[PDB]
Amino acid sequence: SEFKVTVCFGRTRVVVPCGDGRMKVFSLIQQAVTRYRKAVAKDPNYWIQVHRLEHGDGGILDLDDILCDVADDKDRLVAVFDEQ
Amino acid sequence: SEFKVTVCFGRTRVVVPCGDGRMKVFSLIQQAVTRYRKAVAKDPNYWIQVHRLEHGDGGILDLDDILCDVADDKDRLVAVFDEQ
Amino acid sequence: SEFKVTVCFGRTRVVVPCGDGRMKVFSLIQQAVTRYRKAVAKDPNYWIQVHRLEHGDGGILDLDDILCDVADDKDRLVAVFDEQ
Amino acid sequence: SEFKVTVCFGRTRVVVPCGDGRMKVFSLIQQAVTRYRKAVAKDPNYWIQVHRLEHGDGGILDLDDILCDVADDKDRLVAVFDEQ
Amino acid sequence: SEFKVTVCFGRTRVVVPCGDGRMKVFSLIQQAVTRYRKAVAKDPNYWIQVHRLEHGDGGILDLDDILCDVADDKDRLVAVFDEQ
Amino acid sequence: SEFKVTVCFGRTRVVVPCGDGRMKVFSLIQQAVTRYRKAVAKDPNYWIQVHRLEHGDGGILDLDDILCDVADDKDRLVAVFDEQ
Amino acid sequence: SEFKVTVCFGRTRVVVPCGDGRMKVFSLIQQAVTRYRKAVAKDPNYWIQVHRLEHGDGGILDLDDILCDVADDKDRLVAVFDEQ
Amino acid sequence: SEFKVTVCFGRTRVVVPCGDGRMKVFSLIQQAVTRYRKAVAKDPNYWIQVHRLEHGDGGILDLDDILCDVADDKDRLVAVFDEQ
Amino acid sequence: SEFKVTVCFGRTRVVVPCGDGRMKVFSLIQQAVTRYRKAVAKDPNYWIQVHRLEHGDGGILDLDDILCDVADDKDRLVAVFDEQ
Amino acid sequence: SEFKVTVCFGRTRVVVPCGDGRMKVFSLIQQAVTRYRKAVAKDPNYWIQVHRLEHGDGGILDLDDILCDVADDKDRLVAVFDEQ
Amino acid sequence: SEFKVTVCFGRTRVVVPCGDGRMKVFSLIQQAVTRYRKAVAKDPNYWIQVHRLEHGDGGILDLDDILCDVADDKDRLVAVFDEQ
Amino acid sequence: SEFKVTVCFGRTRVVVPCGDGRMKVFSLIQQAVTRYRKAVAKDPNYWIQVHRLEHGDGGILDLDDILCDVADDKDRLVAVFDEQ
Amino acid sequence: SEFKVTVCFGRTRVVVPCGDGRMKVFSLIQQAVTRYRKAVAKDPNYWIQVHRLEHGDGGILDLDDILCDVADDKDRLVAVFDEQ
Amino acid sequence: SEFKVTVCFGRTRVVVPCGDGRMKVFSLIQQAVTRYRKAVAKDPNYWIQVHRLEHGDGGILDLDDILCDVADDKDRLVAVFDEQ
Amino acid sequence: SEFKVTVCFGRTRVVVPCGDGRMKVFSLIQQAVTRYRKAVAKDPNYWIQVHRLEHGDGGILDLDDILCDVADDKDRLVAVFDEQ
Amino acid sequence: SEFKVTVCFGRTRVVVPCGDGRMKVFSLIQQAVTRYRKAVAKDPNYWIQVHRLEHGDGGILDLDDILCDVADDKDRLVAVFDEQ
Amino acid sequence: SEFKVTVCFGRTRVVVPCGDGRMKVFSLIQQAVTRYRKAVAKDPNYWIQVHRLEHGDGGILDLDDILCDVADDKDRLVAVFDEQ
Amino acid sequence: SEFKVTVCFGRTRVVVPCGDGRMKVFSLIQQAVTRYRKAVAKDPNYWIQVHRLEHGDGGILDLDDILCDVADDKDRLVAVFDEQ
Amino acid sequence: SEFKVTVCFGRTRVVVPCGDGRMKVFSLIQQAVTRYRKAVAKDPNYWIQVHRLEHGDGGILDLDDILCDVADDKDRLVAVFDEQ
């Protein structure tokens, strides 16, 4: 659509195409996750439990909502995970 | 809607989705509270008496009003509580 | 409305919702006063003779006028009182 | 209107509401004077011959002109007087 | 059409005519590549495995999508390659 | 208009209202002169041959030109005179 | 027509009338070249191998395309040449 | 008509009425020239070889073309001359 | 009609009713002149040789033409004169 | 009719109903004057010699003309007076 | 225009009005020279061979160029001369 | 253009007009060289083999590159030569 | 581009043009090396095994990474080598 | 990203690229460790139990936390180890 | 957050991550205490009655307050205890 | 707020949190006093007549004023008392 | 305001709150005097003829002037008196 | 203004308020002289021929110049006189 | 300007106002000389061949150069002469 956002999975930040942003939190996390795995995956065998997205010093964004109505656009959010 | 705000519950700041901000103080405090509890709650058994929201050095915001007409948007307010 | 201001009653500064700011000095002082009392009042028995509002080093604002045409917005003014 | 200025009558500086600033020097000096007297007057019996307004090290502003076209806004000027 | 973008192949940045931007990632990479080769190629014998496009500190753009819906326009992206 | 400047006649600096600054050097010198005389004149009997305006260490400003195109605004210039 | 652009041939920049900009790269380079030569040519005997047009730090524009669909308008591009 | 432009002949800039701007470069240069001479000419005896019109840092405008299709309107161009 | 302009005669700027603006330069200068004299004239005995109208930094407008086709509307032009 | 304007008599600005604006300057000044007096008059005993209407920095409007053909509509003009 | 510079002729520094700065080195040197002579000349009989302009420790500025494109503005340059 | 730099040829430092700085090292060295020779040349008979430009303690700048992309602006570089 | 850095090869420090700094460690070391050799090479016959780059007392920079994301800009680093 | 830090492993201090610094203590210690080993390792056979990072006289930094929120950037910390 | 402080527990000083510093004295003392115990604890069996925090010669900080409003940041405070 | 000061009650100096410092002398003396008593009080039975605050050799600070306008911040003042 | 000074009345030095320092010498001497008397007065019956203020070895400050323009701030001056 | 100096008339040194220091030597000598006489004059009948001002061992300052450009500020100069 | 120096003509040292110090040696020697003669000259009839300026034990300063680039400022130099 016209929406897009930024997840920071560790050292690679992964640009997330977000289409319209009309979605609950979940599918994005999948998309990214897919992208993280599209960035450096050797064999697929790992974990993917990402805990939550943050603003720089800004707190935890609730992790279910319609992202586009909470979160705004073209933002860099980090992602706090285990996935090793 | 398009409104959103920031409550600082201690070490975690909790981003509050606020929708339109048309509400008296109370429901938000609930929402956050829910979010604080969605952030780290083990068993639910605790207290939740948050006393009041503040600006950095800025004073106490009256704790009942239509938030959006007093308080502006995309602000970080802290929250002074007992909840242990 | 869209207006708001800051009175500093001693150690607590009290954020004043001001609505539109179309008023003479008096009602605000009441509102705050109410808020000061909403902040820490035990039994109501005290005094409330606040003498005048100031800018940091800036002088005494005349204490009757239509606040919004003298005084501008989103300012911190202190309040010099007896109320003990 | 939207204009305002600052006269420093000795230890109290007196914030002057100036409305639009369209006036010769004189009425303001009255307004302030009124305000100085509204600040601390016991019985009215005193003098009020204020000699001239100054910038910090900046020289004497001619004391008749349309203030707003000479003098700019939201300035602190002092006032050099006898009024005892 | 009206769209265009910027790939940074090493020291030369290569302006990419993008026409309308309606395409998956691939043809562009070819176009540029062609342009890189149109910029300095001696004999054609080299490699061309460009790994991925980036924003300045911004992360990896997924490398297949309809560029124009992810990526916006008139941007400088770099390109991380081997082609020697 | 919106222009104004500062002449330093000895110990008093005399703020000069300059209106628009569209004038050759001469009328200003008169205005000030008038102001100097409006500042402290006893009987009018004196001299008024002011020689030239200066910047702090900055050299002599030619003493005829359209002030506003040479000289800029809200400047303190001194004045080197005999007028005793 | 309504289009025009700017080539920077060394110290003189040469404004290029571009008419409608509907052309491949070549004729313009001629026009300019003609203009460079119309700017300072003594006897015509020189070289004219201009290598390519650039944006300030922006990379090499492919040097054949319909300029107006790649390149936009009223731009300053430099030109990297030998022509001595 | 509705067109007009600005030539800067040295210290005086000379506003050029341009009528419709439908003309090759030459007549304008005459008009201005006439105006320069209408601005300060004592006896007519001088030179008038103006070399070319420029934009501020913008390069040499070819000096023959239909001005209005190259050059746009209500612009300040300078003029580089000998005419002494 | 619907046209009007602004002449700046020194400290007073004098708004000029211009009617339709269909006139050579001369009558306006008279009208204004009349207005300048309608603004502050004591006894009529003075001079009125106004030399030319200007834009702020913009050059000399030729001083005969049909004003409305050169000069546009609702402009402030100054006037450079002797009239003392 | 459909016309209306704004006179600024000192601190109160007085909105002037102007009907169609077809009138010489005079009756309006009366209307306003009437309105100024309708705004705050105690006993009628005062002066009413208003000198002239102005634009913000814009000069003196000739004080007789058919206002609506000079002056446009829905404007704030001030009024410079003695009336005390 | 808006440009101006500073020549230091010995003990007097002479502020140079520069208008637009569009000129080769020469006329300025004349202007100043005129100003130096306007500063202290008794009978005109002297020499005026000024050798070159300098920055404080900064080297010799070539003494012919379009000053404003080499030299920047509001600078103090000295002048090294014989003129006795 | 807007670029300029400083070469230090021995005791005279020679300010170099650099125009836009779009050039390889060579022409500048010529320009300066010309300027050095314009500074003190008696008969032209000498040598001009300048070896390389330096920063104060900063090392040798490669002596061919597009100066403006390596070297920044308004810098003092020295020049290490034989030219006697 | 806009990036540049400093390698200290022994007594000569060699300024390194770095373009954009988007590169792994290796090519730079080559560039410099080339520059060291462009600084003083007689016959090419020597060694070039530079071991690693350092900050003044600051430790060893890993010798492969994208320099610009580790190392910052306009820094002096030394180089510890054998090359004799 | 933009973050980086300094670990002092004994005599070599090892510059640590830190990327964004969003990590718990552990991975860094690995990175460095890798770098220490990339600095001088003969055969890999050794120990790597680094005990904790310090400021100069500043105490022990807790050895698990998100480094970037505790520890600031571009700091030299030492490392107290056995690894022989 | 961005806040941090330093407690000196005897010979080890223990860097305290403080997050935002919005807390009464107590939790910090716990955190540190935890850190002291994370620094050298064998079996947990000891005491932890720390009496109060000090500045070098600076007196006792009241031991309950919101630390960040009393105490400033990045300070070394010692701690006076029994804990053996 | 941001203000704080230091009272020296004998051997213990007692850091005084001062909040904003907007207060007459008295409440502070209480606060400290409270703190002195919070520092070492056994049974409360003692005296508390502190006579006055001093600078090192600096004289007696008047003991009523708005401390923050006399006294500056982050100062050590001693206190001269009987309280035994 | 922000100004303050130090008078040394004999063995007690008396810190003088000075507010803004805009005053002739006299009122201060009163203030201090009041403070001296607030420091140790038994019955009021004494003398108060203080002769003049001094710098350590620095001479007599004229004893009428606007203190703040002569005398600077936060100075210790002594006072030479009879007051017994 | 901000300038001041020190004359040493014999045993009393007399602090001289100097205002801005823009003056030839003479008026100061008067001011001081006035101050010397304001320090100890019985009947006025004496002499006042002060010969010249000195630095400690530093020589005679020419006794006419603009003091502030020769002499610096906040200096102690002595004065060598007859005045008995 | 801001420069000044010290010549020691025998027993009187003569402070030399030097203005900016931009001059060859000669004029200063004149100025001083003038000052020496302004210090003690009876009838003018004497000699003035001062041989050279020295530092205390420091050698002869070449006696022609631009003083300020050799010699520094606020120095005492002696002068070795015949002038009797």
Side-chain angles (χ1 to χ4, degrees), chain O residues 52-67:
Chain O
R52 44 262 184 288
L53 282 63
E54 314 286 294
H55 337 69
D57 283 345
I60 300 57
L61 224 129
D62 189 27
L63 17 73
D64 33 274
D65 273 74
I66 283 311
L67 53 303

Side-chain angles (χ1 to χ4, degrees), chain H residues 69-83:
Chain H
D69 196 4
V70 186
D72 32 54
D73 202 54
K74 317 295 307 302
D75 326 279
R76 289 175 38 165
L77 306 311
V78 309
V80 193
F81 59 102
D82 288 265
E83 87 298 62

Side-chain angles (χ1 to χ4, degrees), chain H residues 42-62:
Chain H
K42 41 202 195 68
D43 54 287
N45 192 289
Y46 284 142
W47 332 316
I48 316 173
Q49 50 293 332
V50 205
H51 293 312
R52 44 262 184 288
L53 282 63
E54 314 286 294
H55 337 69
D57 283 345
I60 300 57
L61 224 129
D62 189 27

Side-chain angles (χ1 to χ4, degrees), chain I residues 1 4 12-13 15 17 38 74, chain J residues 57 59-60 62 64 69-71:
Chain I
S1 309
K4 299 181 181 179
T12 301
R13 46 279 303 95
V15 28
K38 196 198 190 179
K74 317 295 307 302
Chain J
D57 283 345
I60 300 57
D62 189 27
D64 33 274
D69 196 4
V70 186

Side-chain angles (χ1 to χ4, degrees), chain A residues 2-83:
Chain A
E2 320 299 316
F3 218 85
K4 299 181 181 179
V5 199
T6 355
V7 163
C8 325
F9 292 149
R11 323 277 38 80
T12 301
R13 46 279 303 95
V14 41
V15 28
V16 191
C18 292
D20 203 295
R22 294 289 285 88
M23 192 213 279
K24 262 206 154 209
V25 155
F26 267 66
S27 262
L28 182 144
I29 311 159
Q30 321 162 332
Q31 291 275 82
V33 144
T34 65
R35 293 147 168 85
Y36 197 176
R37 291 183 292 160
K38 196 198 190 179
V40 65
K42 41 202 195 68
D43 54 287
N45 192 289
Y46 284 142
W47 332 316
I48 316 173
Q49 50 293 332
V50 205
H51 293 312
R52 44 262 184 288
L53 282 63
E54 314 286 294
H55 337 69
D57 283 345
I60 300 57
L61 224 129
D62 189 27
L63 17 73
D64 33 274
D65 273 74
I66 283 311
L67 53 303
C68 61
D69 196 4
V70 186
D72 32 54
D73 202 54
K74 317 295 307 302
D75 326 279
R76 289 175 38 165
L77 306 311
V78 309
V80 193
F81 59 102
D82 288 265
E83 87 298 62

Side-chain angles (χ1 to χ4, degrees), chain J residues 34-82:
Chain J
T34 65
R35 293 147 168 85
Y36 197 176
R37 291 183 292 160
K38 196 198 190 179
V40 65
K42 41 202 195 68
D43 54 287
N45 192 289
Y46 284 142
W47 332 316
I48 316 173
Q49 50 293 332
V50 205
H51 293 312
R52 44 262 184 288
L53 282 63
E54 314 286 294
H55 337 69
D57 283 345
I60 300 57
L61 224 129
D62 189 27
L63 17 73
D64 33 274
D65 273 74
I66 283 311
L67 53 303
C68 61
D69 196 4
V70 186
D72 32 54
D73 202 54
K74 317 295 307 302
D75 326 279
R76 289 175 38 165
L77 306 311
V78 309
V80 193
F81 59 102
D82 288 265

Side-chain angles (χ1 to χ4, degrees), chain F residues 52-62, chain K residues 5-16 32 35-36 39 75-79, chain R residues 69, chain S residues 1-3 18-22:
Chain F
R52 44 262 184 288
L53 282 63
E54 314 286 294
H55 337 69
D57 283 345
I60 300 57
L61 224 129
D62 189 27
Chain K
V5 199
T6 355
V7 163
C8 325
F9 292 149
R11 323 277 38 80
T12 301
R13 46 279 303 95
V14 41
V15 28
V16 191
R35 293 147 168 85
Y36 197 176
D75 326 279
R76 289 175 38 165
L77 306 311
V78 309
Chain R
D69 196 4
Chain S
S1 309
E2 320 299 316
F3 218 85
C18 292
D20 203 295
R22 294 289 285 88

